[PDB]
DNA sequence: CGCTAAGTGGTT
DNA sequence: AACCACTTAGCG
C-alpha cells in the first residue's frame, strides 16, 4: 500500500518554506528539531526538503 | 490541471 | 541513511 498523501497545514508549509529559505539542507538534528516543532514525522520533513530541492532546481532553470 | 507527496532504482 | 533523478499518483 502507498502511504496516504500528507495534507500539510498552513502553519506547517509556512514554517517549512521559512526553514528552506534559510537552509537548503538540514543536519539530522535540525531536521528532527523542525519535525518535532511542526508535529510532523522525521520522514515527512526529509521528504518535503527533498521534493522542495527538486522544485528549487526546476525554478533555478 | 497545477502543484507536489510518496515510491523506485541507483549514487553518494 | 541521506540524497538524486525521475515516476506514480492524490488533492485543492
A58 C-beta less than 7 Å away from strand B: no
- CA A11 to chain CA centroid, Å, is 12
Name the nt closest to A52 by C-alpha to C1'. B4
Burial class (CB in 10 A: 0-12, 13-18, 19+), A39: exposed
Note whether A57 and A20 are within 8 A (CB): no
Note whether A35 and A8 are within 8 A (CB): no
A41 C-beta less than 7 Å away from strand B: no
Note whether A49 and A25 are within 8 A (CB): yes
A29 C-beta less than 7 Å away from strand C: no
Name the nt closest to A46 by C-alpha to C1'. C2
Nine cell digits for residue A57: 532546481
Amino acid at each position: 500500500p502507498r502511504k496516504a498523501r500528507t495534507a500539510f497545514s498552513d502553519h506547517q508549509l509556512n514554517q517549512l518554506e521559512r526553514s528552506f529559505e534559510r537552509q537548503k539542507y538540514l543536519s539530522v538534528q535540525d531536521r528532527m528539531d523542525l519535525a518535532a516543532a511542526l508535529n510532523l514525522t522525521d520522514t515527512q520533513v526529509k521528504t518535503w526538503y527533498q521534493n522542495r530541492r527538486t522544485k528549487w532546481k526546476r525554478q533555478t532553470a
